[PDB]
Each structure stands twice: as C-alpha cells, then as structure tokens.
Amino acid sequence: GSSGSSGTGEKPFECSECQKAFNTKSNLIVHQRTHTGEKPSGPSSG
C-alpha cells in the first residue's frame, strides 16, 4: 500500500519537536533552539 521506511538507518541524535535526524549533537542542539516562539515558519492549516 503506502510504502515508506522499509529498512533505513537512524542517527544517534534526533530532535524532539520535529524529530529530525542529526550527525553531531552540537548541530542538533543549535537546531533545537530554533524551535522557539509561535508560528515561526507558518501554520499547517491542513
């Protein structure tokens, strides 16, 4: 039906809000901050 991730590796560091994959922690940490405030990029609306 709706294929997807049959067998894909994972990263040692993953976000908490968007759950994004990262190689280094430093890069991740800095990426976590961006997740602040409200409607930073734009609402989904569907």
Q: State yes or no: residue 20 binds Zn ion (CB under 5 A).
A: yes
Alpha carbon 18 to chain centroid, angstroms: 4
Q: Which of 38, 39, 32, 36 lies closest to 18 in space, CA to CA? A: 32
* Residue from the set 14, 18, 24, 25 that interacts with Zn ion by CB under 5 A: 18
* Closest distance to Zn ion from the beta carbon of 16 (Å): 7
For residues 23 and 11, is the Cβ–Cβ distance under 8 A? yes
Compute the least distance from the CB of residue 22 to Zn ion, in Å: 9
- Which residues of this chain interact with Zn ion, rule CB under 5 A? 15, 17-18, 20
